[PDB]
Amino acid sequence: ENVQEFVLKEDCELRFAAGDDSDVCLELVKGYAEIFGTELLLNKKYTFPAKSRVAAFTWKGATIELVGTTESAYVAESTPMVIYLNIHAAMEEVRKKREEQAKAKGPRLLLVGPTDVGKTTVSRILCNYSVRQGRTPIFVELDVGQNSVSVPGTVAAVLVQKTADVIDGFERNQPIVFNFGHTSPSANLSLYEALFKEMATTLNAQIQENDEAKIGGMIINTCGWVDGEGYKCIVKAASAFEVDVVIVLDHERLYSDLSKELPEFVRLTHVPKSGGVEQRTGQIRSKMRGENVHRYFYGTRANNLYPFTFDVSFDDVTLCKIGKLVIMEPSADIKHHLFAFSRSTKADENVLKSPVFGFCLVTEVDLEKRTMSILCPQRTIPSKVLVFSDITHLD
């Protein structure tokens, strides 16, 4: 209940972090402002939980109130927001040109760069800006570590029809989700690459049946792995998704290399990272993976989910594992692991390329009763083919 007031000139952003113990309430009291591309409503109170990192930007100028203990709060005057806006502008230009020559295929954009340069944040701003233009782009999440669509260990895609919630991020409206099963692509690089392609193939077939999605195009977020084998992932992602535009954030050498390698038709743009982007340690990142898993089952402060715990007979499910498909015996070592419900009706070669229904968490294993307790988003298992993930979570 301490109060801070901020006057933001045009093209300025208030960056703040909520206290370690404290909620911070933000209210726009004059003008117009947006948080990572989502417009703030005048006088609406936005409660951010402890440790939240937030940036509120304004094009024309704003006055903003914060109520609560903050670790840091300052106004920055020079951001790359204009750059990020012109990227959206050029995408929409491409949409119109292709519309006037047509079903029109929307432009596809790949965001690349090392850890903590703001690829996710920029993907969010671009998705929001497209929605505010009246478009429905497809957001494609290839980061199996820091995943904003599903649990970690997935490659996923979602049609974006609403701007992100300011506090909770995007609504996960019926995502297409593939179970990769690891927090980094180097754990099985060829499987990771096969999922890209199966994802790209699936999306190409789906947009055939939906013109809005088709002209919406794609914003594709990669992980921060740019060196060695990560570089080749970028080239194969570019190719498999047939991208028109590669945005490289804060990596001149990557940009140089990609310019010499990509098809000449590919427009490549190097842009700086924002001064507000925060370096995150392995610990913080591990904690964020845990909170992602937690959110998948329980939702948010704003939007609670109510997941079911029940027992499942080992005679009613087949547990399997990728690394080719192998059938698993119920064992004590599956405890705390995620399992994906495979859309594939049988435990065969189709599992590898099949998207999934969702996940459960194995909370207990009773070997003698031949049962396991699972946490599950629904009352009854949506599939009897359960695919192992190396991601674990103590609840």
Ligand X SMILES: Nc1ncnc2c1ncn2[C@@H]1O[C@H](COP(=O)(O)OP(=O)(O)O)[C@@H](O)[C@H]1O
Contact footprint for Mg ion (CB under 5 A): 119-120, 146
For the chain, breaks with the C atom over 2.5 A from the next N come after 102, 323
| Residue 119 annotated in ligand binding | yes
| Residue 117 annotated in ligand binding | yes
Distance between CA atoms of 376 and 316, rounded to whole angstroms?
A: 16
Is 107 an interacting residue with respect to ligand X (CB under 6 A)?
Answer: no
Using CB under 6 A, pick the residue from 128, 274, 354, 389 that binds ligand X. Answer: 274
**CA nearest to 292, candidates 320, 119, 37, 284:** 284
List Cβ neighbours of 251 (8 Å cut-off, separation of 6 or more): 112, 113, 114, 117, 226, 270
Residue 142's CB is within 10 A of a number of other CB atoms, namely 26
Is 121 an interacting residue with respect to ligand X (CB under 6 A)?
Answer: yes
Helical packing angle, 229-240 and 189-207, nearest 10°: 20
Residue 81 CB, shortest distance to ligand X, in Å, is 8
Distance between CA atoms of 272 and 345, rounded to whole angstroms?
A: 47
Beta carbons of 109 and 220 less than 8 angstroms apart: yes
Could you tell me how many residues of this chain bind ligand X (CB under 6 A)? Answer: 17
| Residue 395 annotated in ligand binding | no
Our CB check for ligand X shows the closer of 276 and 355 to be 276
Contact footprint for ligand ALF (CB under 6 A): 115-116, 119-120, 143, 146, 223-224
Number of residue whose CB is nearest ligand ALF: 224
Is 120 an interacting residue with respect to ligand X (CB under 6 A)?
Answer: yes
Beta carbons of 385 and 345 less than 8 angstroms apart: yes
Distance between CA atoms of 279 and 63, rounded to whole angstroms?
A: 28
Is 15 an interacting residue with respect to ligand X (CB under 6 A)?
Answer: yes
Residue 331 CB, shortest distance to Mg ion, in Å, is 34
| Residue 19 annotated in ligand binding | no
* Binding partner of residue 154 among ligand ALF, Mg ion, ligand X, none, CB cut-off 5 to 8 Å per kind: none
Using CB under 6 A, pick the residue from 24, 35, 117, 142 that binds ligand X. Answer: 117
| Residue 121 annotated in ligand binding | yes
| Residue 120 annotated in ligand binding | yes
Using CB under 6 A, pick the residue from 14, 35, 40, 55 that binds ligand X. Answer: 55
Residue 101 CB, shortest distance to ligand ALF, in Å, is 35
Distance between CA atoms of 254 and 189, rounded to whole angstroms?
A: 20
**Cα–Cα distances in angstroms (integers) from residue 71 to residues 19, 226, 284, in the given order:** 5, 32, 17
Binding residues for ATP: 13, 53, 116-121
Residues that bind ligand X (CB under 6 A): 15, 53, 55, 113, 115-121, 146, 224, 274, 276-278
Binding residues: 13, 53, 116-121
